[model samples]
Target chain A: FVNQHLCGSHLVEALYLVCGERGFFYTPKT
Target chain B: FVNQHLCGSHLVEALYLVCGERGFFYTPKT
Candidate 1:
């Protein structure tokens, strides 16, 4: 069963928050 | 020019933190 729920926005928001806190530069591929 | 640095751990950590805070379930595909 290929059951999955993916939220691109959620991941992006999380990444941005983490990057901001860790001082890591974030560049989106798309 | 394919210049990019990616840290899987960082992304995982961020995802986990965000999911925890937002009450979203996280499951690793790997």
Candidate 2:
């Protein structure tokens, strides 16, 4: 499941934090 | 910033958990 409307700078930051903790992926070039 | 290489069923579960916490988005059709 994914959110079609889920995208933004704000969510990016949140995802970064979450992914970082789990080492799911690296941050992309900004 | 977003991860182009970061996508999979595993990652989807992780994202769902993370997004659920912040209410950034909702689960999509599975």
Candidate 3:
């Protein structure tokens, strides 16, 4: 049961890929 | 103080309402 699997790695991947396609990057200026 | 409000009504509301559009319901079927 992947109750929270989408909240894990898959969510990150989804955000990264979807945002990347929209010209966004995970470049957090720390 | 909605730390879990989204996890509650908001989450259920979003899921239930959105899923309803795709032919889903709140039938946990316990």
RMSD of 2: 10.3
i-RMSD values for every candidate model: 9.9, 6.9, 10.9
Q: Assess the local accuracy of residue B4 in candidate 1 as a C-alpha lDDT between 0 and 100.
A: 27
Q: Which regions of candidate 3 fall more than 4 Å away from where they truly are?
A: A1-5, A21-30, B1-30
Ranking of models by DockQ = 1, 2, 3
Model 3: which residue pairs collide?
none
Provide the TM-score for each candidate, comma-separated: 0.28, 0.24, 0.25
Better of 1 and 2 by DockQ: 1
lDDT (Cα, 0-100) at B11 in candidate 1? 57
Q: List where candidate 2 sits over 4 angstroms from the true fold.
A: A1-7, A21-30, B1-30
Winning model by DockQ: 1
Residues B1-30 of candidate 3 have per-residue lDDT tens digits of: 112223444455445433444554554553
Q: What 10-residue stretch in candidate 1 chain A is worst by lDDT? A: A1-10
Candidate 1 per-residue C-alpha lDDT over B1-30 given as tens digits, one digit per residue, 9 for 90 to 100: 122243666556544654564554455687
Candidate 3 scores a C-alpha RMSD against the true structure in Å of 11.8
DockQ of each: 0.09, 0.07, 0.04
TM-score of chain A of each: 0.40, 0.40, 0.41
